[PDB]
Design a binder for this molecule. Structure first.
Ligand SMILES: [K+]
Length: 262
């Protein structure tokens, strides 16, 4: 047990929930893990994998991101701030990717999933890029039920950090596509209370949040510290009762501990 792990354990003890953390520091290609091999519900952090899979498809179809997708009234689900403006109209796969990532639009996510042939298409892409842990089993919003012990729509912090590094900093995607994914993540609207809140202001962050039942509060980020090589950081948090409140502050505190421990 390292000093950073001891701090994270103390944070977890006082939070009342279960915390999972994985850091990869690309300066030295080392990792720091807390419950790194335990499974957690991804919730909407899974949208990164779906968007990335569509970006991969776009490497062999120049026009794919411009392809229109029909949005029908029946397509709207529980949280659709972008798609609802386009009902009885269309959105392109680029628009759907941006809406899913930057606004966490669930209708947009479902269109990405459908473009990949269902949740198992997202899992297939994960396997193709070397992630044997990730699984997507359901569409939105049911992928966010986050029931303790349920393997559906889960990954581990270790696996997710490794994948997010490959996607954003490594060569899982082509150069154009990697840059597009990074642009999207950096433009996220939903992240300032989560990992971002625990880091010095000068550091730049691209991230995707998630949340679900059981007070599940997640964030996965690529971080460009001031004067340091990039980091990838996953923070997952889930609680024992179905109706628990979100705890984005716990993610911020985990990020703060990680930053202080570099
Ligand atoms: K909740």
């Amino acid at each position: 047990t390292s000093a950073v792990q001891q701090k994270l354990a103390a944070l977890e003890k006082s939070s009342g929930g279960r915390l999972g953390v994985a850091l990869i520091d690309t300066a030295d290609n080392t990792q720091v893990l807390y419950r790194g091999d335990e499974r957690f519900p991804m919730c909407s952090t899974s949208k990164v994998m779906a968007a990335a899979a569509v970006l991969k498809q776009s490497e062999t179809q120049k026009q794919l991101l411009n392809q229109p997708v029909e949005i029908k009234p029946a397509d709207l689900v529980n949280y659709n701030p972008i798609a609802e403006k386009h009902v009885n109209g269309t959105m392109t796969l680029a628009e759907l990717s941006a809406a899913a990532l930057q606004y966490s639009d669930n209708t947009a996510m479902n269109k990405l999933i459908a473009q990949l042939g269902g949740p198992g298409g997202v899992t297939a892409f994960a396997r193709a890029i070397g992630d044997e842990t990730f699984r997507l089993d359901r569409t939105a919003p049911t992928l966010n039920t986050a029931i303790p012990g349920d393997p559906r729509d889960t990954t581990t912090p270790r696996a997710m950090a490794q994948t997010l590094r490959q996607l954003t900093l490594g060569h899982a995607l082509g150069e154009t596509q990697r840059a597009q994914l990074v642009t999207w993540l950096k433009g996220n609207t939903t992240g300032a209370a989560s990992i971002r809140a625990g880091l010095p202001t000068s550091w730049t962050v691209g991230d995707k949040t998630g949340s679900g039942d059981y007070g599940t509060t997640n964030d996965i980020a690529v971080i460009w510290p001031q004067g340091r090589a990039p980091l990838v950081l996953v923070t997952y948090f889930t609680q024992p009762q179905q109706n628990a409140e979100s705890r984005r502050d716990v993610l911020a505190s985990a990020a703060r501990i990680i930053a202080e421990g570099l």
